[PDB]
Amino acid sequence: SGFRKMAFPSGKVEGCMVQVTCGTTTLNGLWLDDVVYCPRHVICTSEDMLNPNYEDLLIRKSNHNFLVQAGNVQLRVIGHSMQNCVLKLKVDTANPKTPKYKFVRIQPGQTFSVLACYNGSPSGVYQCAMRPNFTIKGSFLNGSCGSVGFNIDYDCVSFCYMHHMELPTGVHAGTDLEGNFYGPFVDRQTAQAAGTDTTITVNVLAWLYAAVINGDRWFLNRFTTTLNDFNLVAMKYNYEPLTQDHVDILGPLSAQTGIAVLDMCASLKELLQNGMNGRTILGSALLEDEFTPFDVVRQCSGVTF
Amino acid sequence: SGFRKMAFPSGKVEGCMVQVTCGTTTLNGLWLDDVVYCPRHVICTSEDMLNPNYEDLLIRKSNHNFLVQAGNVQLRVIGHSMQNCVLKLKVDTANPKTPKYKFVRIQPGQTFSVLACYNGSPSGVYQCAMRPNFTIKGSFLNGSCGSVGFNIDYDCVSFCYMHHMELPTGVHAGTDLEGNFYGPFVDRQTAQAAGTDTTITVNVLAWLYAAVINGDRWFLNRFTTTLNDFNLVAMKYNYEPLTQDHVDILGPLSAQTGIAVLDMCASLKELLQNGMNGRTILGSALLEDEFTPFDVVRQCSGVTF
Numbered sequence: 001s002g003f004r005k006m007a008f009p010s011g012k013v014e015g016c017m018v019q020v021t022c023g024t025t026t027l028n029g030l031w032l033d034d035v036v037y038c039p040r041h042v043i044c045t046s047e048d049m050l051n052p053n054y055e056d057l058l059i060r061k062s063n064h065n066f067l068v069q070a071g072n073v074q075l076r077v078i079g080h081s082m083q084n085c086v087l088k089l090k091v092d093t094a095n096p097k098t099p100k101y102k103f104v105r106i107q108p109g110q111t112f113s114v115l116a117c118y119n120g121s122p123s124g125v126y127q128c129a130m131r132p133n134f135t136i137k138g139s140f141l142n143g144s145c146g147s148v149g150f151n152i153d154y155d156c157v158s159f160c161y162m163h164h165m166e167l168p169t170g171v172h173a174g175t176d177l178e179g180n181f182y183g184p185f186v187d188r189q190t191a192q193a194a195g196t197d198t199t200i201t202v203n204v205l206a207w208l209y210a211a212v213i214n215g216d217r218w219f220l221n222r223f224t225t226t227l228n229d230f231n232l233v234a235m236k237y238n239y240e241p242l243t244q245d246h247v248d249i250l251g252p253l254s255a256q257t258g259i260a261v262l263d264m265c266a267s268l269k270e271l272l273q274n275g276m277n278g279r280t281i282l283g284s285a286l287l288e289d290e291f292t293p294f295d296v297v298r299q300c301s302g303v304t305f
Numbered sequence: 306s307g308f309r310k311m312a313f314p315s316g317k318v319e320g321c322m323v324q325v326t327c328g329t330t331t332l333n334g335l336w337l338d339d340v341v342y343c344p345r346h347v348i349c350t351s352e353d354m355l356n357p358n359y360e361d362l363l364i365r366k367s368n369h370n371f372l373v374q375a376g377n378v379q380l381r382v383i384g385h386s387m388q389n390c391v392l393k394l395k396v397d398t399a400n401p402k403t404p405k406y407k408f409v410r411i412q413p414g415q416t417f418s419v420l421a422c423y424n425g426s427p428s429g430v431y432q433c434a435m436r437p438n439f440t441i442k443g444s445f446l447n448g449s450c451g452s453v454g455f456n457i458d459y460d461c462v463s464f465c466y467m468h469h470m471e472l473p474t475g476v477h478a479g480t481d482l483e484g485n486f487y488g489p490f491v492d493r494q495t496a497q498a499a500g501t502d503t504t505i506t507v508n509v510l511a512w513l514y515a516a517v518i519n520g521d522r523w524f525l526n527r528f529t530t531t532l533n534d535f536n537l538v539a540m541k542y543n544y545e546p547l548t549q550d551h552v553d554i555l556g557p558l559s560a561q562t563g564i565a566v567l568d569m570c571a572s573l574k575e576l577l578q579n580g581m582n583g584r585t586i587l588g589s590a591l592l593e594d595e596f597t598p599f600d601v602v603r604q605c606s607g608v609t610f
């Protein structure tokens with residue numbers, strides 16, 4: 001019993017974190033096999049950040065301008081190349097701690113663990129989700145660039161995010177490990193803003209199923225809804241549209257609890273109308289949207305209370 | 306910017322987790338140097354748990370009855386002994402991954418990271434607080450016994466909790482690493498219940514300071530209070546008493562934000578008496594009490610391990 005915001009154990013990723021320095025700029029890098037991946041803006045000064053020409057800045061660097069430190073050991077850079085917004089530094093030593101890994105690009109609503117790092121040293125681990133507006137609500141200070149997001153379903157690490165910047169609202173933007181940004185953001189200090197964010201409807205439904213599994217039903221009602229009528233109401237509360245894919249994805253949780261997806265949709269409609277009336281659901285007074293259907297099945301028991 | 310429930314990086318602890326089996330019972334063990342620590346109830350069957358005589362059950366067990374598995378390697382048990390509610394299995398190999406460590410007993414209100422394990426394999430990491438009623442609101446399924454709680458200071462792991470059981474309300478109970486239970490609990494299947502819980506006042510104040518540091522200031526007011534008048538209010542809302550030690554501990558946060566501790570108490574009193582009025586603080590509609598003053602300073606400064 002219980003339901004916590006749970007991160008994956010971070011050990012496999014801690015063994016990959018290194019410090020990358022280029023002149024006055026220091027940030028984090030991810031060392032896998034003989035390559036160190038890091039944000040390409042490590043080659044920028046504060047005066048280069050408005051309209052950097054990364055190709056022109058990079059051609060002026062040699063391998064020995066990149067200082068890479070793994071623990072108390074200096075690695076030797078023997079090559080470099082840029083792939084989109086990521087810099088790949090070839091080093092003369094393969095990381096002996098390289099886990100089994102993949103690079104995966106995720107979609108909004110997906111969750112992942114973040115290992116926040118500073119100067120190549122891990123400081124903490126937390127769970128988060130790719131918001132519908134492609135930002136993440138992380139906890140990052142100056143020097144955290146290059147910190148990564150990942151999942152570890154089984155013993156293979158799937159790297160999905162590399163941290164690049166903080167927007168004016170305090171939210172964060174970054175790329176996949178191939179250097180493609182999530183969202184309409186650029187690695188420039190030009191005026192940029194997060195678009196209006198919305199609630200991840202499929203995740204809220206998954207978390208309501210988690211509450212039923214853990215033994216709570218106060219929020220259920222005797223009603224059902226059509227998918228279209230649910231979407232017409234939920235969009236008035238800035239909730240993302242629920243698609244037939246989302247309904248299909250919630251099937252296993254529906255079969256486990258005995259509550260049809262559209263019946264859970266009616267409960268959500270009523271919660272949005274009434275609020276909680278002094279009650280909580282899984283220790284929260286707000287509707288939680290950073291647990292996916294996959295997270296709920298992984299964390300909860302297979303026997304409903 | 307941002308403020309997340311953040312756990313310590315778990316790598317140093319992941320390298321210590323093993324699987325302990327005795328008969329039909331399988332649970333987790335902690336391998337440090339040449340000793341494996343685990344709950345003494347691993348020697349119990351479901352019938353024995355009703356009223357176990359652990360010395361009598363232990364005397365029949367030989368070293369070979371304990372099956373200890375570290376990864377895909379079977380360790381050899383060469384001795385066994387009990388210390389309070391923990392079983393110590395002497396093994397023929399010192400753990401090469403043993404970090405610098407200490408065993409520390411924590412007090413209610415203190416926080417720690419939990420590495421949830423099943424079959425000696427870590428599955429997740431989450432942050433939690435020892436409640437004033439000595440339970441923890443964890444997330445644990447059958448097979449999680451022996452999972453541990455810890456903090457990190459510099460490069461030293463301080464082990465503070467070992468998981469033993471789940472109470473009827475779904476909350477959890479366990480021991481320190483010397484086998485002394487936190488709370489008035491015993492390791493047997495018998496009628497046991499968590500006492501009435503209270504809110505950790507010093508931690509709520511720390512989290513209000515974190516919200517201010519992050520730009521959430523709507524709850525601030527011009528008023529102050531005496532410590533005695535505040536504690537009358539705290540008693541009324543089932544909040545723990547605030548001591549002069551708590552006020553002293555919040556000193557640095559008070560000096561950083563410009564809000565005296567008793568000034569923040571006046572904000573807390575108004576929040577208890579009037580609610581949030583549809584507003585949130587750090588994305589929560591409830592007053593959060595699982596961040597200590599030290600956690601707030603650490604996360605708002607980027608301390609690494």
Ligand SMILES: CNC(=O)CN1C[C@@H](C(=O)Nc2cncc3ccc(NS(C)(=O)=O)cc23)c2cc(Cl)ccc2C1=O
Nearest residue numbers: 041140141142144145164165166167186187188189306
């Ligand atoms: C808030 N940021 C800024 O005012 C300056 N800024 C620097 C940099 C950037 O966002 N770094 C940061 C990353 N994560 C958390 C941070 C918390 C705080 C912080 N503060 S600071 C020292 O004043 O920038 C910087 C942080 C950046 C990188 C790229 Cl690729 C694009 C744009 C920028 C940029 O605008």
Ligand SMILES: CNC(=O)CN1C[C@@H](C(=O)Nc2cncc3ccc(NS(C)(=O)=O)cc23)c2cc(Cl)ccc2C1=O
Nearest residue numbers: 001346445446447449450469470471472492493494495
């Ligand atoms: C809720 N538990 C029970 O009804 C039976 N029970 C077993 C055991 C115990 O609490 N283990 C568990 C620990 N953590 C999470 C658990 C989730 C689920 C779970 N399910 S079960 C197998 O069907 O009880 C057991 C869990 C235990 C150990 C001690 Cl030292 C003392 C008493 C007990 C005890 O009463």
Ligand SMILES: [Cl-]
Nearest residue numbers: 105106107110
């Ligand atoms: Cl995805």
